[model samples]
Target chain A: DPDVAYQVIEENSFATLVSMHQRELFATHLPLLLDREKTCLYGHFARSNPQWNDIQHQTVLAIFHGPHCYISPSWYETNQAVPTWNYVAVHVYGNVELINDQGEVMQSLHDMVEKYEAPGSRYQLMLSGMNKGIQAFKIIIKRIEGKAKLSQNHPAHRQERIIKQLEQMPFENEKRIASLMKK
Target chain B: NDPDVAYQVIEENSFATLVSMHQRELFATHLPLLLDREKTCLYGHFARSNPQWNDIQHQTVLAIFHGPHCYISPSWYETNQAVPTWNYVAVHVYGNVELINDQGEVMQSLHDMVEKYEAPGSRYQLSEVMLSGMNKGIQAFKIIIKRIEGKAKLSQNHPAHRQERIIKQLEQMPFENEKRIASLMK
Candidate 1:
């Protein structure tokens, strides 16, 4: 199950980072690189963004969202069901550690580039003084929660009918949900 | 970003992530939101058993309307010097939440939401008794939006040729979000 969560994180690396500061909730949308070996997540926040100012050493939440769609009741075989949503989400809770060393910051950027770039691509993230504008940080993961709500509670025949209807939908989310349901 | 642009994103992507702080702890709930463009507000409901709704009254909450997003590979660029990046569209709304306890108003909101999401000519309809029962089990609320921030990261900083190349690549992707992002880029 954790493996499935990690797969979702890897595919949906663009995450929503949420933290509590002065009893208020703050969130930033950014790309976070997941380090499975270290059990940590790494990302950088813009220096101008105030969310990173008081976030050091604080417990933070990283949300990785996958495909989601509204499931109409009409898709089901019976009229006993109501409408619902099917989605996949992974929440990573951790403590933040701000990286002050410039070398380490550059290394993280380089690693991220390596992961995202094409294998044969020649692009490299060299030191360009842009690191100064970012507040790089790592999250030492403490807990992980993965949720895949794909009509799992329904009977096999009902689920098959729902999947059949979803497969014919126009959106990618519906089709993906159908595929996941089949699995 | 323009308010109209932000409203469009909210309308298209009705499902949103609602985040708020309660008892010094952060809580988030995923639900569908209906945008009242004329009223400049958002409407949604939470299950009565959900603790997040208990202390959310008069508190500042955030509703994040997420749009299409995709990875823009550097291989799509004209040169090899560019690094990879993501292109996305999102709107963040900060507002003061007010609980709507009136059953009539709550049912009306539910009707609005159903009308928005239901297929035309569909036979499915919620009866008054059903809506009343549903209202008893849910807590409806409205958000009076105070601030909004919209971002559309669609490779606008890149050159025209490079942007075109990126759009072409995204258009070929299997995901609908990628194709939507490509359409937005154009």
Candidate 2:
């Protein structure tokens, strides 16, 4: 089960949000690089945003959200079934290590760009004019909690019916849920 | 620009992440929200099994509402000097948590949610027996929104030609969220 959580975090496309000091929430679109052995994550922040100041002062949670969609009760074959949402989310808890070494930060930035940019596209982070306002760091995960609420609690027959209904839907997220349910 | 905009965001994107702290341990739940405009409050429920609902009295909570988001590749911009960026809209609301202990009020909250989610003249029934049993497994709470912040980073600072280029690029994308972002940009 814990292995599934790690797999889900690694396999899916996710948007991340981090909170701190009970007063600030920072949103970023950086893809997290998971280090399995160390239970750590690598990401970066824009230096213009001061939210980076107190990031290491306290424990922060990075919420990696996946696909979610509403499930209608009408789709269920059995009665007395209530409507609910099907989704998967992973919350990583850890204190950040603000990477200060310029070379390490540059390397992290390069890895990130290489993951997203086209194959062999020449775009240097230092020369691309982005380095003036960004900082890179790593999060050594202290705790990892993942929740997959994909109607797995339902009867197998009812689950099949729900999957069929979801397949007929046009929304991509609903189709995603259907596939997750099949798995 | 005002509370009205914040309320609109909540009403549109009802599914929100409610985050709070219990004994300094951060807790969160993804749940649908219903707004009571007259009272300036939000209503939602948490499963009894979820321990996050255990300590809510007098503690401030944060709820994040997400809107359309899409990535803008640097190539889409007309200027060669551009870099890739992601544009998104989001609203954050903060309030103190107060659980509704009255059975009647809690039942009413469930009924209200059904009314909001169901189709017109919906035949889907909310059987009384099922409702009674579910009421025991969940807890309803309300939060009067005290502090609200909304951000719409939709390339507003760029020139019209640049905005049009980005919108056209989003329009060609296959994803639904990107299309929604394109419309929002327009």
Candidate 3:
């Protein structure tokens, strides 16, 4: 499903991966956003990230994750020992379209910073005197595949019970996801 | 910066991709993994059926995403009117190794996959026949930890209203990105 499979467009994103060609898998971080309706993923990475430069016409298996929580099996009355992460995820496979326009490329950079940095945050402004050392581009989502694996498969009662209990999660992310569990 | 942390991410985040080598593209569904700790590298095999693996023998980059993600459209919020957007947590692992050729390693890795995909009574246990069948459909690749960085940028520093508003909107939407990032908020 990697082909025709592409990620949806969104603002403010982050990415990581295990390099498949190396003997030891190493994962690095690069963040981007996808414009689903427009069918393009946008983001910037340091030009120094050789991976971005080396990446060619491959269909990217891009992932977009929302609020999620770790549900301890103990929360359930059952005796399931393995703890599972309850969360929402979206998967996209898209073609990489290198942005050729300087303005578009720079816009991508501005969009990324504007999305992540808090209001009035230092990064909210344009680089003014500096240029982002990285390059920016859009990955068009030719196709999108989504899975909301938030323990929906579980019983309704268990889900409600779990929601109430998970709402107490110390992590705000976990609590937020709990709110989405659809009482 | 921490090797153990990187290794743990790879093992925990099982799904991965063999970015295509033919057109320098990407391919396939299931990928296997192996760690070359001494060399600080990781690699795995791909079935010949999966052509992307073939692209790897030369020299290329591969990727593995760790968790679920979502998109934040300016349309979703009240304050801004902008383009549709995405949010996610990802790890990009780079490497320079060829595809795995060993049939045994491939099968062993397949067994490891059972825990993630199928838990109790999962699938038929490992056997030469199963391996052969899988070999027909799957391919694998590796990543070198030459450089590594990991981040969780889910509007962590955004105002509470923005975070709450986004999460609230996401709850009604069909996707999980907003809901997931909301969990990361204070």
Candidate 4:
């Protein structure tokens, strides 16, 4: 039953945001390495950025996020508050293990390209694969956790209240999630 | 500097997605909760979806998330031998121990949600004008984060030549919002 959430590590074509101490750190294009049996996860950042350095030998957070909308306070029937953001996310806690091997690095590159390219694309492409080298690492799952934070906590009246409020706003995060839920 | 791996986490007015477990079945829904201070606390819900969270109160949970943004290509790295993608990503998690129906703290959380939005020139913020709290009708709580983790996948692994090509490719794409990703590579 893989009670495990989606296997969406580094393989996702979409973007993931990594933050530390509130400031933006360097972004990365990563290929996640996870040991499903051990619940171990791993990936590498470039030597250029030191955000990884700040987190070594310590617990760090990894998140997978999805699309969302903005909600203006004007929509609430109570009319006592302001704006809010509505969205979905998953967080993980793991220890870091840095990678420093040429062959291991090469395998990482080839394996990633294999995942990124579709079956047809892989067959059609003439190029070899990702040639740029990288520095990689492993994430030891000391503890893992998550949250949905959706609007299900309220009763019909308050839920309806938010729905009506969000319906008036074209780009509210709730509406977006609501729309996705519909599909 | 990689833009592709770059995404922004919106701290202002955060709407959270909550998860709960019941009868061993997990339930989830589109509920909104105040992302308590420093995102250490979280609130939200599990609907009748699985009927699991029904009658549920004060249990541990995982607040999963991050908000918007996109990726960067390698051509922007400004170095040689780089193939061409700058990876960018931002993500974190807060492990939680739920404390439900905490009226005082919930109200305080509501207030903080608005306060985090204060900007240099937006002294005219409306949130200040509105009172944020729920001492009456609904249930609220405190979620102290147990853990937080994330990564950014901009193209830091590309050779220099391919990076330029990928940057150009990203530039021509419709998602121009990420063009800044290219600039970041430099």
Candidate 5:
């Protein structure tokens, strides 16, 4: 299941970063690149966003959200069931280490570009004094929680019926949920 | 962003992440929030056992409604000088939560929510007796909106030609988010 959680993180790299600062909760939506070997995450926030100023050495939560959909009770064989939502989410809790070195920040950006860009792409990330406007940091992961709420409690036949119904839906989330349920 | 657009995003993507700081600790709960257009407020409930609901009254909370989002590779641009970015639509609502102690109002909210999500002609309906009993296990509340912010980062700053190129590339992708972003770009 940890493998599946890592896969969700890699696929849904766009994450919500949450932290408590000055007795207030602050959240910023950004993309985080995971370094599996290092068991850490890398990301940058705009300098103007004050959430990053007090984030150093503080515990932060990065939430990676996967596909989710509403599962109707009609999809089941009986009418006694209640409606529910099926979703996959991975929460990474860690301490932040602000990166002051420009070289490391540049490498982080380069690595991000490498990961997102297509092969044979002509885009080149160059140092152009852009690092000053952003604050890059690394999250040393202390804990990780993965949750996949697919109807595991149901029988195989009912699960198959739900998958069939979800597959008929037009939304991408529903189709993805069906596929995940099948798996 | 247009208020109408923000409202539309909230209506379409009802599932939201409700975050708040309670007693010097941060908490987040995921649930569907029904938008009340007339009241300019949002209604939802949390399980009674969920600690996030405790002491949430009058607290400034944030509800995030996330829409379609996808990665945009600079390769789609005409030149190589561009940078890779993501195109997304998101709405953030800041409001003070007010708990609804009246069981009748909570039942009405549940009815409205069920009406919105249930399939057409579905036989399943919430019975009044059942809802009354269910209300005992849930904490219903409404968020009186204080501020709403919506962002649709769909390459609006780019030139028309570059935007077109990005949309074309996204349209060709198999993912639904990419296609939706492409449509939004158009």
Candidate 6:
């Protein structure tokens, strides 16, 4: 189960940092990673952003999202069906442990750049002074859940009709949703 | 910004990440939303099995509406010093939620959702029995608009000439989102 949740996190590396303070709820997107062991997720917060300070001692959530598209009722062959949205997402819940060791932080930074950057790209994080304004930390996952609502409850013919309609749309997200429906 | 802007963004990108907390533990769900313009509130339903439904009345929540996004390559800019970055639009709404369990309100919300999402000529009408059974498994809720924040990072910091270059590059890209970013650049 962790493997499925872990894959969504790795593929959709951009996740929302879901946190709260007293009654105030806030979120921001940041590049995130699942460690090779698949047990913890790592990310950083800008030094000036106060959410991390509140998040460290609390149970935080990171939501990884996949493609989503609207499924119109007309797409279904049956008259009984209603409109719905098909999407893939996972929620990873954990208690955060802030990493102050610069070396490990540097390693995380390197891994992130490697994940996004081309080989020998100009982006560089000098360990000497980079961590000064950013805090890197890991979320030791306590619970994880994944959901794929791609019309799985629908009949085969209805799913095919929806898939055909999605494929006809020009949007890339539509195409991706269509491919998932195909599977 | 006026409340209309928040409503428009939410309407355009109706599916959002709905986040809430209980006892300091955070939870999130991706669901389709309906904006009740007159009430200035949002309405949606969650599967009964989702634990997030139980705590809606207990805490404030946030719904994030994500819009178009695209990467801006520095190579396109004559200002070679510019670093590559992402350009996008997003809106965040903060509010307290009230779960609507009354049968009438649930049916009304369900009908509104269908009317909003259905194709004009073939909209499905729910009979009483059909509505009654599905309502048992869903927890309908509403969140009034308390605060809203909108951000559009579409190269507003760049000069006109540089922005033109980015827009030109985005237009030629194959992805629809990039083309949308180009439109927003205008």
In candidate 3, residue B129 scores what lDDT? 35
- Which candidate model has the greater TM-score, 4 or 5? 5
DockQ values per model: 0.46, 0.40, 0.10, 0.07, 0.52, 0.48
* TM-scores of chain B, in order: 0.94, 0.93, 0.65, 0.55, 0.94, 0.93
Ranked by TM-score, the better of candidates 1 and 3 is 1
Q: Tens digits of per-residue lDDT for model 5 on B42-89?
A: 999988988877778756788889988888887776554465678899
Best by TM-score: 5
- Can you tell me which runs of candidate 1 are displaced by over 4 Å? A1-3, A20-24, B78-81, B127-133
Per lDDT, what order, best first?
5, 1, 6, 2, 3, 4
| Candidate 4 Cα lDDT to native | 0.47
Best candidate (score: DockQ): 5
Residue range A1-183, candidate 3, lDDT tens digits: 232123222522464322222333333455656553556767655566565654446556565545454465546665432334555555556766666577786676666656654464332323422244545666776666654457877888778877888677565566777866763
lDDT of each: 0.82, 0.76, 0.53, 0.47, 0.83, 0.78
Q: Judged by DockQ cut-offs, is candidate 1 incorrect, acceptable, medium or high?
A: acceptable
lDDT by residue for model 1 (A45-140), tens = 778888877897766889999888888877666555667788899888888998979788878888888877767776663435466667889999
Q: Is the docking of candidate 5 incorrect, acceptable, medium or high quality?
A: medium
Interface Cα RMSD in Å, per prediction: 2.7, 3.0, 11.4, 10.4, 2.6, 3.6
Of the candidates numbered 2 and 4, which has the greater DockQ value?
A: 2
Q: For candidate 4, what is the total of clashing residue pairs?
A: 93
Q: Give me the chain B TM-score of candidate 6.
A: 0.93
TM-score of 3: 0.51
TM-scores for all candidates: the values are 0.90, 0.91, 0.51, 0.49, 0.91, 0.87
Q: How close is candidate 5 to the true structure, as a TM-score?
A: 0.91
lDDT score, residue A4, model 4? 32
Q: TM-score of chain A for each candidate?
A: 0.92, 0.86, 0.74, 0.61, 0.95, 0.91
Residue pairs whose backbone atoms clash in candidate 6: none
What CAPRI-style quality would you assign to candidate 6? acceptable
Model 5 per-residue lDDT tens digits across residues A1-183 = 667888999889999898866656667778999985949999988788898778876668888998898888877777666677888888888999988797998889898998888888777644354666788899999888787889998899999999989999888889989999998
